[PDB]
Amino acid sequence: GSMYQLEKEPIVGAETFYVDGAANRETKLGKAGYVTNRGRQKVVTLTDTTNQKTELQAIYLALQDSGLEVNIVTDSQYALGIITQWIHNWKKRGWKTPVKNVDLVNQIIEQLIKKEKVYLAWVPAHKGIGGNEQVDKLVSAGIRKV
Template sequence: MTDDVPEIKAIYTDGACSGNPGPGGWGTVIYFVDGQIHELGGYEPGTTNNRMEMQAAIAALQFLQQHDYHTPIELNTDSKYLIHGITQWMRGWKRKGWKTAAGKAVLNKDLWLALDELTQTLNAEQKVAIDWNYVKGHAGNVGNERCDEIARAFSQKRTISLKKSVDANAGNSSNPAAGAVVKPNPKSRTPKNVDPQTKIPLPTIDTTLSDMSDTRINRVSNMLKLLQTADELAKQGYLITTSELVVLTGVSAIELAKRGDDWTWRNWTVSCVSSESDQEKFWQLERIGE
């Protein structure tokens, strides 16, 4: 740890995107043990929410690297996509040559590679172990709420004052409204046109039974059918429509719009594989860990 950086208590990161894809922003807040706070933020004109979540984490790790920090840290994020990717999925992706279980190219590979290189370098050269910790978003957590505020301000190009406890010239932050130049992120992926695949009929959950014991048994049975359907969809690489995804997951169409193009449901990652030119959105499931 260098003289210009006090001991870090915790780091929070978050990303935001309008449109997904669309204009995005990321926010990183570093809390020091002595009470100081250092904030970073950035803007990307065309990106996704997941990429902004990843970019916020990259900025945090770059801060540690640039300041030659040598103490284990806790990094908090509300992105399960980020945590699962860096702690679980990446091992399988590497074994498969950065392919998913369905044989598709891993989304956001450029940023995953950057995160992987940073974590390995920090651990090997600076002995920095990173504790990737999930925090629920919009639940009153001060660090998470502040990161969200920063990310949204940058995504909308609104002026926001960032706290600076460390020399800003050594960091990676910028404020578009203040006239600073934002360091460009790697190019966002361009979704490929995908032809609809064979659709598997999704089961209908029976909620009309009156007997409580039979109802519980039927609910478990129906849920098992749903999970088996999801597994078959992932195994065969079939694509499903948004309305079918709503039936499968129980997540409303309004909530789906908020979750973006890549998110986690139970044991699967759910990814949008349609381009903006497609008349209807199609989704693909991939079993976590495969």
């Protein structure tokens, strides 16, 4: 019983957003974006950012640009946990909100509860030709070598 329930399995039929972000610590330059299984993609370049911010920013773009039912695959355990924990503990007993990234996370949650159904799952970064590998390349170009 929370302020929303994420889906326990992928939403059959819904479009899938493979999100990723990448940042460079020395310059605080970074990129966030997505590729989808309906031939959609988007990459944005960011300044003054961090790796965790860019993974969160990517999810925000995916929620922003999608319909009411959406599948999101991320490789960030941080991004998944912080969003899931926020949903499960909202208005609950021992909730101290995070300090870091709190503005972006609040922005994401706001987008999130507007949705009808959201499936959000983690996969380890891996090589190959699937979705996570494609967006990883896009957000990595000029930010870090792979």
